[PDB]
């Protein structure tokens, strides 16, 4: 167990192990930045604000470490290190969660660059790279947005802050909607990975226009735009919305064509106009996957089937579980303690 120490930085205890210095605040918990002298990296140390208070925040203390703990890929966020000051389950409180600190994220680029149509191509391909690996897993990111993905100086990509949000946080004019499937924002159907495809379209019309594809003022808005852009849906799709008002609410509204790409995305590749056509699907049984959309022609310059990993098995029945707090406690103590630190 290697030697911790206290101090106080803004109005918050942080006991940390002596290789983490020069902890300086930064911004669910508290965030410093830190000089790792183990490894050489500058890092986030996050330690997690009252992760037991209740079941729920209990389990999703739980869920959050299994769900970090698993990820290693290239253009996904990793684990470097997890820890707490307490030597026993007893004395247990504190979780603190270690990752490469990141700089400038999607939107530091987006608003305040040019960007080719190559640098599309290699984002664009590095997100779907990472999403492959994720939903072999069964994992859905379900929160893909410019402010959820971190660029280098030399235009690589990693995939954070996975979806593990309140009516509030969604409502009005707001970017944490903008990138939604319309069947998640307007609780259509169960949802799977699908959603996040719809996302990476949002994404890529944005670096392509370099504007908000969706900006709704509001749910409504949004359909309304998503609906001029895509068409309306056929009796098909509408079988498929469970809710009884929503289908009518659907079937209030005009009918309305799919309209030509290629006139909205005034004088993009061709190629990357197709491949937004295959993204940006109403009905979710007929998108592109990640794996499928590795293997279209806008990516041919990058696209390696050797060189595209999936993710080792994934068990999520702990979902299903109706564990006390003290249990989530216990199962979350165990998994601090079996950590084994990447290479
Ligand atoms: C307005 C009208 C629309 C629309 C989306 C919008 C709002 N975003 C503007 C465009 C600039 C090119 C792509 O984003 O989709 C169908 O009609
Ligand atoms: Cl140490
Ligand atoms: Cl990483
Ligand atoms: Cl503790
Ligand atoms: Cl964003
Ligand atoms: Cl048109
Ligand atoms: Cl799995
Ligand atoms: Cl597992
Ligand atoms: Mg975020």
Same mark, same amino acid.
């Given at each position: 167990?290697?030697?911790?120490?206290?101090?106080?930085?803004?109005?918050?205890?942080?006991?940390?192990?002596?290789?983490?210095?020069?902890?300086?605040?930064?911004?669910?918990?508290?965030?410093?930045?830190?000089?790792?002298?183990?490894?050489?990296?500058?890092?986030?140390?996050?330690?997690?604000?009252?992760?037991?208070?209740?079941?729920?925040?209990?389990?999703? &203390?739980? =869920?959050? !470490?299994?769900?970090?703990?698993?990820?290693?890929?290239?253009?996904?966020?990793? @684990?470097?290190? +997890?820890? $707490?000051?307490?030597?026993?389950?007893?004395?247990?409180?504190?979780?603190?969660?270690?990752?490469?600190?990141?700089?400038?994220?999607?939107?530091?680029?987006?608003?305040?660059?040019?960007?080719?149509?190559?640098?599309?191509?290699?984002?664009?391909?590095?997100?779907?790279?990472?999403?492959?690996?994720?939903?072999?897993?069964?994992?859905?990111?379900?929160?893909?947005?410019?402010?959820?993905?971190?660029?280098?100086?030399?235009?690589?990509?990693?995939?954070?802050?996975?979806?593990?949000?309140?009516?509030?946080?969604?409502?009005?004019?707001?970017?944490?909607?903008?990138?939604?499937?319309?069947?998640?924002?307007?609780?259509?159907?169960?949802?799977?990975?699908?959603?996040?495809?719809?996302?990476?379209?949002?994404?890529?019309?944005?670096?392509? &226009?370099? =504007?908000? !594809?969706?900006?709704?003022?509001?749910?409504?808005?949004?359909?309304?735009?998503? @609906?001029?852009? +895509?068409? $309306?849906?056929?009796?098909?799709?509408?079988?498929?919305?469970?809710?009884?008002?929503?289908?009518?609410?659907?079937?209030?509204?005009?009918?309305?064509?799919?309209?030509?790409?290629?006139?909205?995305?005034?004088?993009?590749?061709?190629?990357?106009?197709?491949?937004?056509?295959?993204?940006?699907?109403?009905?979710?049984?007929?998108?592109?996957?990640?794996?499928?959309?590795?293997?279209?022609?806008?990516?041919?310059?990058?696209?390696?089937?050797?060189?595209?990993?999936?993710?080792?098995?994934?068990?999520?029945?702990?979902?299903?579980?109706?564990?006390?707090?003290?249990?989530?406690?216990?199962?979350?103590?165990?998994?601090?303690?079996?950590?084994?630190?990447?290479?």
């Amino acid at each position: 167990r290697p030697t911790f120490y206290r101090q106080e930085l803004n109005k918050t205890i942080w006991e940390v192990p002596e290789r983490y210095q020069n902890l300086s605040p930064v911004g669910y918990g508290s965030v410093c930045a830190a000089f790792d002298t183990k490894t050489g990296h500058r890092v986030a140390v996050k330690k997690l604000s009252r992760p037991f208070q209740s079941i729920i925040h209990a389990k999703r &203390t739980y =869920r959050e !470490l299994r769900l970090l703990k698993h990820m290693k890929h290239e253009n996904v966020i990793g @684990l470097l290190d +997890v820890f $707490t000051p307490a030597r026993s389950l007893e004395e247990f409180n504190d979780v603190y969660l270690v990752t490469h600190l990141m700089g400038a994220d999607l939107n530091n680029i987006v608003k305040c660059q040019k960007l080719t149509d190559d640098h599309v191509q290699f984002l664009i391909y590095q997100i779907l790279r990472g999403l492959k690996y994720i939903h072999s897993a069964d994992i859905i990111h379900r929160d893909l947005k410019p402010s959820n993905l971190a660029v280098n100086e030399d235009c690589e990509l990693k995939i954070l802050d996975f979806g593990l949000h309140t009516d509030d946080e969604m409502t009005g004019y707001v970017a944490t909607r903008w990138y939604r499937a319309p069947e998640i924002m307007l609780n259509w159907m169960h949802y799977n990975q699908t959603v996040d495809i719809w996302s990476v379209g949002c994404i890529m019309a944005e670096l392509l &226009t370099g =504007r908000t !594809l969706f900006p709704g003022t509001d749910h409504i808005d949004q359909l309304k735009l998503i @609906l001029r852009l +895509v068409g $309306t849906p056929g009796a098909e799709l509408l079988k498929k919305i469970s809710s009884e008002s929503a289908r009518n609410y659907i079937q209030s509204l005009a009918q309305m064509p799919k309209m030509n790409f290629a006139n909205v995305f005034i004088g993009a590749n061709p190629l990357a106009v197709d491949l937004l056509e295959k993204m940006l699907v109403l009905d979710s049984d007929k998108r592109i996957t990640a794996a499928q959309a590795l293997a279209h022609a806008y990516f041919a310059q990058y696209h390696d089937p050797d060189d595209e990993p999936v993710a080792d098995p994934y068990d999520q029945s702990f979902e299903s579980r109706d564990l006390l707090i003290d249990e989530w406690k216990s199962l979350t103590y165990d998994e601090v303690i079996s950590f084994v630190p990447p290479p």
